[PDB]
Amino acid sequence: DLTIQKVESRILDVPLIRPHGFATTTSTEQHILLVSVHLENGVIGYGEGVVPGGPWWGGESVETMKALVDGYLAPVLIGRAVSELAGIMADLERVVARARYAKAAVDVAMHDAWARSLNVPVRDLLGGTVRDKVDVTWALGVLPLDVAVAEIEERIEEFGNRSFKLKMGAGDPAEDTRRVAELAREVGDRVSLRIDINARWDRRTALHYLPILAEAGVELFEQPTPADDLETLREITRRTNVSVMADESVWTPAEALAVVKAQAADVIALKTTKHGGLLESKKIAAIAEAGGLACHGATSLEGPIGTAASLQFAASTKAISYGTELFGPQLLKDTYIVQEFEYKDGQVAIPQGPGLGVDVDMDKVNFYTR
Amino acid sequence: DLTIQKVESRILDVPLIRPHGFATTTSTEQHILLVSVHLENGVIGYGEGVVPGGPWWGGESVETMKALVDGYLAPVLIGRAVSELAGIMADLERVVARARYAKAAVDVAMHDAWARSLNVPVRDLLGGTVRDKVDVTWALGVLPLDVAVAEIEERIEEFGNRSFKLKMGAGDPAEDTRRVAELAREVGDRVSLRIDINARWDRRTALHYLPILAEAGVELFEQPTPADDLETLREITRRTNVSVMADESVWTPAEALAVVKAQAADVIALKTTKHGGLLESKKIAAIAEAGGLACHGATSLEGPIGTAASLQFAASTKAISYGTELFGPQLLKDTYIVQEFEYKDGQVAIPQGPGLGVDVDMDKVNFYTR
Ligand SMILES: [Mg+2]
Numbered sequence: 001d002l003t004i005q006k007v008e009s010r011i012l013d014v015p016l017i018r019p020h021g022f023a024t025t026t027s028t029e030q031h032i033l034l035v036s037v038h039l040e041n042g043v044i045g046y047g048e049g050v051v052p053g054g055p056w057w058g059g060e061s062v063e064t065m066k067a068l069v070d071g072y073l074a075p076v077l078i079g080r081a082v083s084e085l086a087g088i089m090a091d092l093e094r095v096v097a098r099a100r101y102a103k104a105a106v107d108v109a110m111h112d113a114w115a116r117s118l119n120v121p122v123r124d125l126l127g128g129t130v131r132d133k134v135d136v137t138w139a140l141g142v143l144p145l146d147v148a149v150a151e152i153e154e155r156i157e158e159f160g161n162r163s164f165k166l167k168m169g170a171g172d173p174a175e176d177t178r179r180v181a182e183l184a185r186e187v188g189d190r191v192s193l194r195i196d197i198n199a200r201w202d203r204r205t206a207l208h209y210l211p212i213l214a215e216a217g218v219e220l221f222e223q224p225t226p227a228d229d230l231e232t233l234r235e236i237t238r239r240t241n242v243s244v245m246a247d248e249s250v251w252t253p254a255e256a257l258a259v260v261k262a263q264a265a266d267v268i269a270l271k272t273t274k275h276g277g278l279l280e281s282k283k284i285a286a287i288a289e290a291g292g293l294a295c296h297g298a299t300s301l302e303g304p305i306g307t308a309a310s311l312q313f314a315a316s317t318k319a320i321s322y323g324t325e326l327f328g329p330q331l332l333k334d335t336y337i338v339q340e341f342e343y344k345d346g347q348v349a350i351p352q353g354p355g356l357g358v359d360v361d362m363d364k365v366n367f368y369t370r
Numbered sequence: 371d372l373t374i375q376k377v378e379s380r381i382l383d384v385p386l387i388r389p390h391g392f393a394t395t396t397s398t399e400q401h402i403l404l405v406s407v408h409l410e411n412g413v414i415g416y417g418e419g420v421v422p423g424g425p426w427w428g429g430e431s432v433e434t435m436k437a438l439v440d441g442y443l444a445p446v447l448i449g450r451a452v453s454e455l456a457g458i459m460a461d462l463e464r465v466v467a468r469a470r471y472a473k474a475a476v477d478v479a480m481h482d483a484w485a486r487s488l489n490v491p492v493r494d495l496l497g498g499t500v501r502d503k504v505d506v507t508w509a510l511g512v513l514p515l516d517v518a519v520a521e522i523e524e525r526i527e528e529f530g531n532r533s534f535k536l537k538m539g540a541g542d543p544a545e546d547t548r549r550v551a552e553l554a555r556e557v558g559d560r561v562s563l564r565i566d567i568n569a570r571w572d573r574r575t576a577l578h579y580l581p582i583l584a585e586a587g588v589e590l591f592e593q594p595t596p597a598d599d600l601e602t603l604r605e606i607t608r609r610t611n612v613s614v615m616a617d618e619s620v621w622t623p624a625e626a627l628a629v630v631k632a633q634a635a636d637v638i639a640l641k642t643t644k645h646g647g648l649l650e651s652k653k654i655a656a657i658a659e660a661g662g663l664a665c666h667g668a669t670s671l672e673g674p675i676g677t678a679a680s681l682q683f684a685a686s687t688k689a690i691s692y693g694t695e696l697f698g699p700q701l702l703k704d705t706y707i708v709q710e711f712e713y714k715d716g717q718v719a720i721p722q723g724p725g726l727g728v729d730v731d732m733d734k735v736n737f738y739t740r
């Protein structure tokens with residue numbers, strides 16, 4: 001009855017309102033692998049296979065995830081009750097190692113299908129509610145000084161964001177630094193400024209310039225250097241006294257443990273997609289919390305479905321103690337979720353209702369399908 | 371509707387079939403604090419606040435737990451929806467630090483009441499099911515060589531336990547070692563033997579006598595020394611090459627992390643009661659698993675309700691990778707649960723049905739109620 005009859009995966013290409021530039025690429029649209037789990041009782045659960053723009057972030061892409069979901073992961077679920085969630089996730093490991101991003105979609109789809117079948121929010125399968133609204137940090141892709149300052153002013157006045165994250169890593173380090181430092185002198189008094197270089201600066205470059213950003217008021221350095229170099233993340237804090245947030249360095253529980261042991265970061269960017277599901281995400285939080293490391297409700301620039309899965313997680317996870325950056329839906333020029341999220345006064349309310357708390361619009365899903 | 375209207379706690383004194391001897395005390399009965407969460411919709415949930423025999427183990431007793439449950443934890447629940455489980459557990463921390471055994475009762479009770487209202491097993495609020503039966507190690511309290519050998523032989527034939535745990539710590543260490551050493555030469559071949567001294571041997575004594583039990587075939591040394599001394603746990607494994615299981619050393623996630631950093635134990639005695647609830651237990655499991663440490667579904671000698679809770683935890687947690695010792699109920703002269711656990715072939719099946727999958731027989735509850 002609660003059996004899984006079928007699992008489908010659709011690649012969706014949705015355009016962004018503005019070009020979102022990273023250290024080495026620029027997105028004009030997000031690619032989302034919308035995965036669905038179809039249960040015998042007719043209910044359909046949805047999950048997202050999504051990374052920030054492309055495989056430049058970590059090696060997985062919508063194409064890569066569909067090949068894995070379709071050809072290896074999905075076939076494991078078929079013929080089993082969705083109420084075997086934990087056991088199925090464990091069996092996925094036997095057919096596909098790593099590939100957490102692909103797995104996260106299967107996990108979320110199963111949670112949705114199950115929570116709707118039981119007629120409850122997805123968070124009630126994750127411990128209940130701790131909060132009904134979270135803070136949201138607004139991230140700006142790489143933008144010229146004037147454009148950035150302008151976008152911050154607009155955001156402050158229209159959405160109330162009290163914190164902003166500035167992506168870096170494109171072009172010359174000395175100029176990139178100047179760009180951010182200057183922007184900090186014009187905004188650092190009204191809001192909390194953080195940066196993120198997506199591991200595209202080498203250790204020497206980070207240790208040389210980050211001090212300049214620290215003096216300018218930047219309060220948080222997200223993954224400025226390579227994911228594997230935990231000693232360097234620790235060293236940049238030693239020399240600048242400003243917190244570091246690990247992102248590409250932490251995908252798995254084992255990697256969260258490694259950061260704890262290396263005292264490599266004050267904060268961990270927790271993303272339900274990158275960790276390979278809501279179950280894995282709970283593990284990241286447990287480890288971080290035990291080592292005294294704060295967790296941020298981070299985003300892989302998920303669409304409405306993915307963002308809703310992450311908000312349900314934040315709603316039930318006390319260890320998400322450093323707000324979030326779950327603004328994905330806002331970056332999209334259009335959606336496919338029927339309902340709308342409520343972003344006001346620097347926050348966003350948790351989606352009330354069964355499943356993720358938001359339903360898909362099959363017309364728009366079909367419209368944006370590749 | 372899901373509103374917690376009332377929370378009650380009763381001390382239950384249930385007789386044991388045989389006296390259970392520990393390192394410094396001998397129990398003729400087990401004390402259990404039965405906590406019930408009463409919801410608006412009329413559904414009631416139960417959880418056990420229980421320690422092995424008494425306060426000698428860790429400072430908490432049925433009396434201490436009742437004082438805290440009735441006078442501090444309970445008031446926090448009243449007027450709130452049980453669907454706020456996680457947030458309620460966080461707020462308990464504001465009025466009572468530590469006291470994990472007392473808190474575990476509140477956590478299990480809410481999960482029971484909550485799962486019943488949604489008409490699902492408790493495991494369904496913890497990820498679903500990975501297994502439906504678990505191995506069971508049978509523990510023998512302190513007993514003369516003959517009485518011990520006899521029991522093991524008997525259990526093997528009647529219930530088929532394939533592993534046995536021998537309690538130590540009473541009287542002379544040398545004699546104690548000889549006692550176990552000899553029992554090993556008579557049974558060690560057929561089954562897996564483990565010991566537990568409940569932290570009642572000092573470092574020097576453990577390092578001196580444990581090699582003898584190692585040479586005699588004992589495969590696991592459970593907490594033979596003080597909870598605080600992790601380096602000693604590490605050192606006994608270094609000199610004997612036999613795995614250690616941390617029990618009194620690990621109650622909280624931070625303590626589990628400390629054991630990981632100290633490489634102090636190969637296995638962690640995971641008890642839903644000692645950890646302060648099902649939520650906390652999940653955390654223990656996540657940290658252990660990330661560090662490669664195995665988890666044993668251990669027991670605080672809970673009654674049928676507690677054991678059911680721990681069985682639901684084991685059904686949903688792949689991290690429980692070293693069997694369990696959830697034989698608690700079998701030690702009681704009688705029970706207050708209507709149904710009965712299915713023991714056979716050295717295992718026990720996970721109870722099916724809503725809540726803990728086991729209903730309390732109020733008539734028997736009232737009969738053993740102090
Ligand atoms: Mg990042």
Ligand SMILES: [Mg+2]
Pocket residue numbers: 566568592593617618639
């Ligand atoms: Mg023990």
